[PDB]
Structure formats: structure tokens, C-alpha cells
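dumping this here before i forget
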Amino acid sequence: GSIIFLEDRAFQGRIYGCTTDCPNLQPYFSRCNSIVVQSGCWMIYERPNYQGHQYFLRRGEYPDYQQWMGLSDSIRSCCLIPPHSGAYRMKIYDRDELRGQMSELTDDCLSVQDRFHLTEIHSLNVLEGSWILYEMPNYRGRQYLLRPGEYRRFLDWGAPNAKVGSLRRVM
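structure:
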């Protein structure tokens, strides 16, 4: 994995590269307005120690922070999402604490509404693989990284509420 952070838009100014997880990028740059992801799947963060708004980035060029649907030029931490072989799987619930109706998901989902007839997911259990949860359909809006494990409440993935629009396997 290799991600390159660059100070200004259209890839100009100082460039700084990371081949692995970094809890605080603040000592290396005061802002980031474009990024080149050479390899790997990455989640970058607005604040140090993986806090704040999250953003998912895959191989490719990002000429401005809006390219990764960012909200500002502040990126202070990043992590390389661990590769994964095999299948992906998770169960979603319409109640918290893994209560309510359960649904199986083993592939991508552009519209939680269409697939599950749900506007909100109050709890879920990621069994295999890493995923990205989006507040809006078609992988838009606020993003939250999901690692294998239990998520008993929407607080567990960091969202302000239980509204969920789409789910994407990280690959």
C-alpha cells in the first residue's frame, strides 16, 4: 500500500507518502488538497488517531478533496485497510443490540432501501471482510469504515444517527 498526500489542488506543492497506518500526519503537512493512491485500500481521517470524518480511497488520482467527497483540506491520520481473501459477510438488524429482523449481506448494496426496505440500520454484525457504510445510496454522503466485529449501535461506527443508504465491500 502507498498513498501520497499533496498540499495543493491538482497535485502541486509538497508531497508526503505513507506505506502504512499513521495516527497523526499533522507534523508533516498543514493541509491536503489532492491525493494519489498508488496501491491499497485506504481510509483517511479529518482528525488524528483516526477520529473525525472518514473517507475511503482506492487506487487512483484525487485532484481535490471533493474527489473523495471530503469536507475540508484537513487530513491528519490514515490507515491501510488489511487485504482480504474469500467472501464477505455481515448481518443487518432493524433494531439495536442485534435485535429485530436480521438480513444477510454477502455482496455490495447500492440501496439499503431497495434491498432491505429500510431507511435505517440500528445494528449490524460484520462476520467476514471490511466494508464501507454510507449515509446515502450509491456510495454517497458520509462514510464509515467497518471492520469484522459487532456494532450494537450506530455510535459504534461513528454516525450521528442510524440512517444508512448503501454498503460496500472493501476490495
